[PDB]
Design a binder for this molecule. Structure first.
Ligand code: A1L6C
Ligand code: GDP
Ligand code: MG
Length: 169
C-alpha cells in the first residue's frame, strides 16, 4: 500500500490555513472559504520519487466534538504551524500552537514546519529574521508561502513530509 501521511494545519483565524490547503490540493486561490469549516483533504503526490497520500486536516478551531479531528490529532504525523506575515498576534500565537502539539504527542520532537503565509503582501509586520530565529529555536524548518501566488506552497507540505520521513528513520 502507498504510504499515507495525516498532516494537521493549525494557526490563528484568517492566516490562510484553508487557502494554503485548497491551493495545494486544487491549484486555485479561495478568498471566501467559510472560516468555520473544518474538513480533511487528500492528494496523491510524489515527493523525492516516493508516492504518498497527503491526508490534511484544515482546522477551524470550532467547539463542536469531531471524531475526525480526534483521529487526526491522535494519529497525525506532522503539523503545519501557520502565521500571516502581516499579523503580529498570529505570530505570537505560534508558541501556544507548538505547546498544544507537544501536549497532544507528549514529545518535544514532533515533525513540524513553521509557515509564514501571505508573503505576496507589502504590509510585513513579522520580518523573515524573527521567524527564522524562532524556527531555529524550535529546531524546525521555516517556509515563506503565498497561497495567492503558490510560492512556497508545495515546499511547505513536502518539507513537512521530509521531516516525518527523517523522524521515522
Ligand atoms: C477563523 C477561525 C479559525 O481559523 N480558528 C482556528 C484557531 N482557533 C483556535 C483558538 C482560538 N481562538 C484557540 O484558542 N485554540 C486553543 C485552544 C482551544 C486551547 C489552547 N490553546 C489554543 C491556541 C491559543 C493554541 C485552538 N487550538 C487548536 C488546537 C490545536 N492547535 C492543536 Cl495542535 C490541538 C488541539 Cl486539540 C486544538 F484545539 C486549534 Cl486547531 C484551533 C484553536 C480558533 C478558530
Ligand atoms: N494576499 C493573500 N491573502 C491570503 C493568503 N492566504 C489567505 N489569504 C486570504 O486571507 C483570508 C483568510 O484565509 P483563510 O484561508 O480562509 O484563513 P483560515 O481562517 O486560516 O482558514 C481569505 O480572504 C484569503 O483569501 C495569501 O497568501 N495572500
Ligand atoms: Mg479556514
Amino acid at each position: 500500500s502507498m504510504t499515507e501521511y495525516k498532516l494537521v494545519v493549525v494557526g490563528a483565524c484568517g492566516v490562510g490555513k484553508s487557502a494554503l490547503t485548497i491551493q495545494l490540493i486544487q491549484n486555485h486561490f479561495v478568498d471566501e472559504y467559510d472560516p468555520t469549516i473544518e474538513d480533511s483533504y487528500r492528494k496523491q503526490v510524489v515527493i523525492d520519487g516516493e508516492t504518498c497520500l497527503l491526508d490534511i486536516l484544515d482546522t477551524a478551531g470550532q467547539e463542536e466534538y469531531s471524531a475526525m479531528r480526534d483521529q487526526y490529532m491522535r494519529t497525525g504525523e506532522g503539523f503545519l504551524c501557520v502565521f500571516a506575515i502581516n499579523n503580529t498576534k498570529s505570530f505570537e500565537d505560534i508558541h501556544h500552537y507548538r505547546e498544544q502539539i507537544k501536549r497532544v504527542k507528549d514529545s518535544e520532537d514532533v515533525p513540524m514546519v513553521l509557515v509564514g503565509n501571505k508573503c505576496d503582501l507589502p504590509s510585513r509586520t513579522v520580518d523573515t529574521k524573527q521567524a527564522q530565529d524562532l524556527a531555529r529555536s524550535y529546531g524546525i524548518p521555516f517556509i515563506e508561502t503565498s497561497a495567492k501566488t503558490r510560492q512556497g506552497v508545495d515546499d511547505a507540505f513536502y518539507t513537512l513530509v521530509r521531516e516525518i520521513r527523517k523522524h521515522k528513520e
